[PDB]
Amino acid sequence: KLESMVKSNYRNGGLDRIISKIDFDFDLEL
Amino acid sequence: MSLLDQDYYLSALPEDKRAELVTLQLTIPLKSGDEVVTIDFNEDVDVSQLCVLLESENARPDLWLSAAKVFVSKGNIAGSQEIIRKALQSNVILDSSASVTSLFHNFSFWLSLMEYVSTNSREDQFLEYASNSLQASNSLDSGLILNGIGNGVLYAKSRRYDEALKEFDNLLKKKSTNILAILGKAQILYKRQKYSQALELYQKALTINPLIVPDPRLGIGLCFWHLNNKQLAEQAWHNSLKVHPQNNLNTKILICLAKFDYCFNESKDDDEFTALYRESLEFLHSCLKEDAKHPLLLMVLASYYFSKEDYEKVEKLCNLVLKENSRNAAFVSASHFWLARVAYHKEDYVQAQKQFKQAEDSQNSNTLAKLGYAQCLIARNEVGDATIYLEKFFKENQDSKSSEMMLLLGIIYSQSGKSYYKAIIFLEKYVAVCQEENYPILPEAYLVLSRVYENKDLNVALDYLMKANDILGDKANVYVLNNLGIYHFFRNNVSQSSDFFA
Amino acid sequence: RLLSALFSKDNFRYLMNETSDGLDVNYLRIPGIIENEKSLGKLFSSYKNLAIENLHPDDRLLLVDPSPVFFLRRPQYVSDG
Using only C-alpha atoms, what is the Rg of chain C? Predict the structure, then answer.
């Protein structure tokens, strides 16, 4: 069932939303 | 088990090679006789004073060149060049044979090579300086194999790979135990994309010398990446970092890239994807706390910040990288691609298409830039122009596994209608690639295939429609059910047609 | 999102070309190869005492072909008796 379990939003195309749901603060120079 | 570290191969080697080879104190006999002076390189050693003292005492050239090597380790390339020049001015080298002068000329050659490497600029000037020093060394002493190695490296830097390969063949004729010859041959083979042939040389060099710089395990990991065994690549890179914990941030960068790839292609669930992605981000940031201006790290972070809708900072990082690393065309291509991606939200179709074209021209290996170029052509309603570009790319890259490109080709040909056969081929290829990649097959490709097969095979069209309906599950629409019912009606499946109509 | 999926498929494939900085070879990098003029030969002959056995087991695991069998002898010329 791992073949079907791996199919999720990022494979469906919702990867960008997932990254948006992951918040992190960097020490950006710019 | 036995700990895998630098100390492991230290203890493997005899104590003669353990402590003496890493001494930070240099013993210099004085001209007065038995008197000697010991100067520790841990302290701030002045180049001028040390050279003056060495000239006054007329010490052996080994001490001069060892001090030059240590100052190279200190990064004092100018100081090492001064040491070499004043050694050439010293009485010992003037009274020694031409072999010592040739060795110091080759040391100056290595100094020019390091000066070019540490800056990646002024390549012609430093190459000419190194060539003059190496030619002087060869004239003074042509029997030194180090002169041949320098000649091969000069050929490699000027991309004269055939001459360097001939030089390494001559070195192999001289002796097969030359580690530097193996490393140079493997580097050339990798430059010639002979990943496996360079891999055997990498393994042989690693077996001969596990403590050799440059690290063979970097090339072994690159080969494993080329051979898809990236897990062994990461393990070897971890072992290298254990052996080389300093001045080897590139290994950490490769490890972070491998972790990101594993997160992208292996995460079985959204929560696992989030955990792996955040761990990779934290590791990348920890590496960034050492170097905050590395262009590749900024380019990698640009993807995350574009996904975070931080397009302004993406533009800032892209422009900064373009200003710093304009020499590297791949970074220019990546920055142009990211600028086009940002402008896509702004829908600057002309500007985004121009940026995609510039990205392609900078680095032709960027398939994503060409795909964005085709997408921008579609955006500008350039159906024929996009079709011609896509046909050119496919015919030039028939072996490329661009599944989305083939899906777009099939959709375009289905819209055209007359090219249904290419549409079928491309959609089947997309289906096969997705099945091999364990990625969700788009039911739209199935609908297009069924529409095409309506005029060829009702059976295959009905089968594809059933597959699309199974993929949709609860996402079944009225048109799909109506077409299934009509298919069963044409198949005289009265019960199934009635059920689909209901 | 189609281009995002394409990026995820590609990831950072063609960005490893610059990471070849480890391929460059310089003589001065090794600490003990230069301390004597013949330290190169000494270090080349310093590892003759070592072999595959002296390699770390994990590093031996890194040696993967891209065990002896009892019935394959190594040829001889004088035999015995």
Answer: 23
